[PDB]
Design a protein around this ligand. Structure first.
Ligand SMILES: COC(=O)[C@@H]1[C@H]2CC[C@@H](C[C@@H]1O)N2C
Lengths: 219, 216
């Protein structure tokens, strides 16, 4: 079917201009559909921003004023979003979607791309291993984990053993502090398996272009 | 413009029962064509919204027949027959009659399940973090129900409240449970000054607090 994917810088300095791209595949954007941009603020409040249709029809949210501009490129099949003079107030996750006449969107939404407006500098995260200090009642489960600390801005994706281990995994919401994010993730496996079979955690921080893999070893 | 109000549910519901979510508009959403433009979406933790119903009572494609909408021109209801654990998340309604296409504040759905006691795991600072001058102690309290929980840290037996940061997850879509991680962060020189560090969790599933601990 159809697929939409938003891309763009996850960090913008206040006063500046924000710019995101939504690349469609499997379907042409030069169709009479409302190719729209929507955003979700911290608190989960959802807001409609605007849309471009039939390549030359654009409508916008009165409230964004005249700092919003929605354009496209038929050759590459992508429409763009541009928002002038952004303030922290604009920090949020941006989703592109395809609405039709009757408000139906189907499964035609992008994965959303997080944008943060701030003056702070991008800082990659430091990954630390969480092993058990001592032993415990084996012949059951063992819980290991990773600690991601001091990264800016959101987000960071954590996967275990390159993603080939998804059950028994728990990744917690990042908490802010001194304008620096920190979060943890746990994973639980049969004691009989660790540390024989090694267990790593991968942390990718797109904002800084870094990816870390950390093996959890016995202390 | 139009103001859409969503009411919160008063209590977690029982699996296999019928649930109703309500949304109200300060302006009628009926259009000159006789159609009522209201959309219902479900958004699960870490996902993009998902259209469920549109045109007030029409099922999006590939959506369970357990979901259905009804209403007037200003009062709407999403009915979920035989609610399943995979249905938790946040339900929003959107008006599609006039600019801007206003969204609803959202309604959260919680599933009732068997009370489970937390699985506590405490971990000490990594040699990597310590060679940095920092030191954090982590404690995971996994897969418990209900969500109400209280954690308490103690250094050398004495209660501590400075440096702790808690992060609760949302209700699991498979086993309906909740999980929390508490992190006690102190400076390295401070950590080398104490020997005992304990994590104490007080849940309804027991009078006595589950206490995990270690000694430097
Ligand atoms: C603000 O204009 C709209 O929402 C239009 C009208 C006409 C049909 C339906 C959807 C359109 O986008 N609306 C009731």
């Amino acid at each position: 079917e159809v697929k939409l994917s938003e891309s763009g810088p996850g960090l913008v300095k206040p006063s500046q201009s924000l710019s995101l791209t939504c690349t469609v595949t499997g379907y042409s954007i030069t169709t009479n559909y409302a190719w729209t941009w929507i955003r979700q603020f911290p608190g989960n409040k959802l807001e409609w921003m605007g849309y471009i249709r039939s390549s030359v029809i654009t409508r916008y949210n009165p409230s964004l004023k005249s700092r919003i501009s929605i354009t496209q490129d038929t050759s590459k099949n992508q429409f763009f979003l541009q928002l002038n003079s952004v303030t922290t107030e604009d920090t949020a996750t941006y989703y592109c979607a395809r609405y039709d006449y009757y408000g139906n969107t189907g499964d035609y939404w992008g994965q959303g791309t997080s944008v943060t407006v701030s003056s702070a500098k991008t800082t990659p995260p430091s990954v630390y291993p969480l092993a058990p200090g001592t032993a415990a009642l084996k012949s059951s489960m063992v819980t290991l984990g990773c600690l991601v600390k001091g990264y800016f801005p959101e987000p960071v994706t954590v996967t275990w053993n390159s993603g080939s281990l998804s059950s028994g995994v728990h990744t917690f919401p990042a908490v802010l502090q001194s304008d620096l994010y920190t979060l943890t993730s746990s994973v639980t496996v049969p004691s009989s398996t660790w540390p024989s079979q090694t267990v790593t955690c991968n942390v990718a921080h797109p904002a800084s272009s870094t990816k870390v893999d950390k093996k959890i070893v016995p202390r | 413009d139009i103001v859409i109000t969503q009411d919160e549910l008063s209590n977690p519901v029982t699996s296999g029962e019928s649930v109703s979510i309500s949304c109200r508009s300060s302006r009628s959403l009926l259009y000159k064509d006789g159609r009522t433009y209201l959309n219902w979406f479900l958004q699960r933790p870490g996902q993009s919204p998902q259209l469920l119903i549109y045109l007030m009572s029409t099922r999006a494609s590939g959506v369970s027949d357990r979901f259905s909408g009804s209403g007037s021109g200003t009062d709407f209801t999403l009915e979920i027959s035989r609610v399943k654990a995979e249905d938790v998340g946040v339900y929003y309604c959107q008006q599609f009659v006039e600019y801007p296409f206003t969204f609803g504040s959202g309604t959260k759905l919680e599933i009732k399940r068997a009370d489970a006691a937390p699985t506590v795991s405490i971990f000490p600072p990594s040699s990597e973090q310590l060679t940095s001058g920092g030191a954090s102690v982590v404690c995971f309290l996994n897969n418990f129900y209900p969500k109400d929980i209280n954690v308490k840290w103690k250094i050398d037996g004495s209660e501590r409240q400075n440096g702790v940061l808690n992060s609760w997850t949302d209700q699991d879509s498979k086993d309906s449970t909740y999980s929390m991680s508490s992190t006690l962060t102190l400076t390295k020189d401070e950590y080398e000054r104490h020997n005992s560090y304990t994590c104490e969790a007080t849940h309804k599933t027991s009078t006595s607090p589950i206490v995990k601990s270690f000694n430097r």
